[PDB]
Amino acid sequence: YNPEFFLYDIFLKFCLKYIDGEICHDLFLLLGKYNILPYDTSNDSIYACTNIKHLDFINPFGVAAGFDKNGVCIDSILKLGFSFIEIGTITPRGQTGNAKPRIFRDVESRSIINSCGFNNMGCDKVTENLILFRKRQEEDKLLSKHIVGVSIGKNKDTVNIVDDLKYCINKIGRYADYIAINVSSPNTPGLRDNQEAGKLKNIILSVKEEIDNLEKNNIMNDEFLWFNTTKKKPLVFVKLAPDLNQEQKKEIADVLLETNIDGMIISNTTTQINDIKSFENKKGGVSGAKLKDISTKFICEMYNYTNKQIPIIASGGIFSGLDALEKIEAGASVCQLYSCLVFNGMKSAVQIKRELNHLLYQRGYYNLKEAIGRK
């Protein structure tokens, strides 16, 4: 491995015991901004590359939304060894989010709870940050072929979700490889109710429509319209919460096929977790190890209910290569990490890529794509 990763695990050990969780996170981000994290400069195995339609991932691990909300250190997080990152969730206008403290960690169970409430700098600032990233990407050998998706959402006092989505799309869409529609945060009331079938359908179609209209105004070639990685219009995903009834699920499955959505992220955080003692005090959505089983089962169902037609992005509870293969066997094409980063540290992507590779060999798969959906 590397010593650089070593010191940071030590600093991280310290910070987990004594420092407030949001502060640790900001600290991590500040280190990224300053470009003093370690680099994974290794070639990823050609046997674990993956794709979602025409969107190609050099490796199957990315970082989930809510980690770099404002795109302040995309380079540095990608350079840890991840194939992609999802920035945001963003909203049209900058927002403080809910009252601090709003993030707590339980180390022993490797779980997190949060009630952030979409704290972010807003679309215009985040768009400016993405633009600067995209300019660096053109000059930096390590960033080529790396994917950046943008998670989009609504301001908390916004009545019309769709108007919020549309505005985001027209601002930042050109710079995104994909757009994740966040209708699943349990920290802005209601929002989660937008997963009801009628509103969701309308939402997907308006998203898809605004993206298409990006292409129509401009005089330039596509090479110049899409200032992203794929050089094409961003794909459209929707991230779902796991706190839904079986009937609801089958009904959401239906609308995804009907609207021909490019993919689904399963899943967002849960509020259905009761047995974490340090979290009785606390409010919001739950991440980490305890979410793994629920999230896995949710992938199975949706893959089934969509007839293996809608590419799945998996989240969360993913810590090991084994955790990772479970998701893939259940039907995920690609995996996002969040908590693992928090508890396992900067080495997370290097560690997990090796384990997925070593485990793909013991199960005698020829490559990753062959494992998808092999229950």
Ligand X SMILES: O=C(O)c1cc(=O)[nH]c(=O)[nH]1
Ligand Y SMILES: CCCCCCCCCCCC[N+](C)(C)[O-]
Q: Please tell me the count of residues contacting ligand FMN according to CB under 6 A.
A: 27
Site string (26-65) toward ligand O8A, x via CB under 6 A: -xx--x----------------------------------
Question: In the annotation, is 185 catalytic?
Answer: yes
Cis, bond preceding 101 (omega within 30 deg of 0):
yes
- Rounded to a whole number of angstroms, the distance between the first and last alpha carbons of the chain is 33
Q: Of residues 305-344, which lie at the interface with ligand O8A (CB under 6 A)?
A: 341-342
Angstrom distance (rounded) from CA 369 to CA 168: 33
CB-neighbour burial class of residue 125 (10 A; exposed 0-12, middle 13-18, buried 19+): middle
Cis, bond preceding 267 (omega within 30 deg of 0):
yes
Q: Exposure string (b/e) for 52-84, b if CB count within 10 Å is 16 or more? A: beebebbbbbbbbbbbbbbbbbbbbbbbbbbbb
Q: Of residues 86-105, which lie at the interface with ligand O8A (CB under 6 A)?
A: 103, 105
Does 15 interact with ligand O8A (rule: CB under 6 A)? yes
Of positions 21, 32, 38, 153, contacts ligand Y by CB under 6 A? 38
Point out which residues pair with 151 in neighbouring strands: 180
Taking the least distance from each CB to ligand FMN, the nearer of 50 and 336 is: 336
* 115 assigned ligand-binding residue: yes
Q: Return the closest-CA partner of residue 337 out of 262, 347, 176.
A: 347
* 321 assigned ligand-binding residue: no
Does 209 interact with ligand Y (rule: CB under 6 A)? no
Angstrom distance (rounded) from CA 261 to CA 258: 8
Q: Residue 319 Cβ, how far from ligand FMN at the closest point, in Å?
A: 8
Does 211 interact with ligand O8A (rule: CB under 6 A)? no
Does 114 interact with ligand X (rule: CB under 6 A)? yes
Is-contact 170 210, C-beta < 8 A?
Answer: yes
Residue at shortest CB range from ligand O8A: 11
Of positions 129, 155, 228, 287, contacts ligand FMN by CB under 6 A? 287
Helix (H, G, I), strand (E, B) or coil at 204: helix
Of positions 70, 155, 182, 348, contacts ligand FMN by CB under 6 A? 182
* 239 assigned ligand-binding residue: yes
Cβ atoms within 10 A of the Cβ of 196, count?
15
Contact segment (CB under 6 A) with ligand Y among 34-42, 239-247, 278-286, 322-330 equals: 34-42
Q: Residue 115 Cβ, how far from ligand FMN at the closest point, in Å?
A: 9
Of positions 1, 7, 51, 100, contacts ligand Y by CB under 6 A? 7
Does 315 interact with ligand FMN (rule: CB under 6 A)? yes
Q: How many CA atoms lie within 13 A of 185 on its CB side?
A: 28
Q: Return the closest-CA partner of residue 41 out of 71, 86, 69, 5.
A: 5
Taking the least distance from each CB to ligand X, the nearer of 185 and 229 is: 185
Angstrom distance (rounded) from CA 359 to CA 375: 16
* 283 assigned ligand-binding residue: no
Does 317 interact with ligand FMN (rule: CB under 6 A)? yes
Does 66 interact with ligand X (rule: CB under 6 A)? yes
DSSP secondary structure code for residue 270 in this structure: B
**Could you say which of ligand X, ligand FMN, ligand Y, none residue 111 binds, taking C-beta under 5 to 8 angstroms by partner kind?**
none
Taking the least distance from each CB to ligand FMN, the nearer of 226 and 349 is: 349
Q: Of residues 204-263, which lie at the interface with ligand FMN (CB under 6 A)?
A: 239
DSSP secondary structure code for residue 120 in this structure: B
Does 268 interact with ligand X (rule: CB under 6 A)? yes
Is-contact 107 21, C-beta < 8 A?
Answer: no
Angstrom distance (rounded) from CA 175 to CA 191: 25
Q: Which of 83, 185, 267, 295 is labelled catalytic?
A: 185
Cβ atoms within 10 A of the Cβ of 174, count?
22
* 229 assigned ligand-binding residue: no
DSSP secondary structure code for residue 310 in this structure: S
Instruction: State the residues that interact with ligand X by CB under 6 A.
Output: 66, 89, 114-118, 182, 184-185, 187, 268-269, 285
Instruction: State the residues that interact with ligand O8A by CB under 6 A.
Output: 8, 11-12, 15, 21, 24-25, 27-28, 31, 103, 105, 112, 341-342, 345-346
Active-site residue set: 185
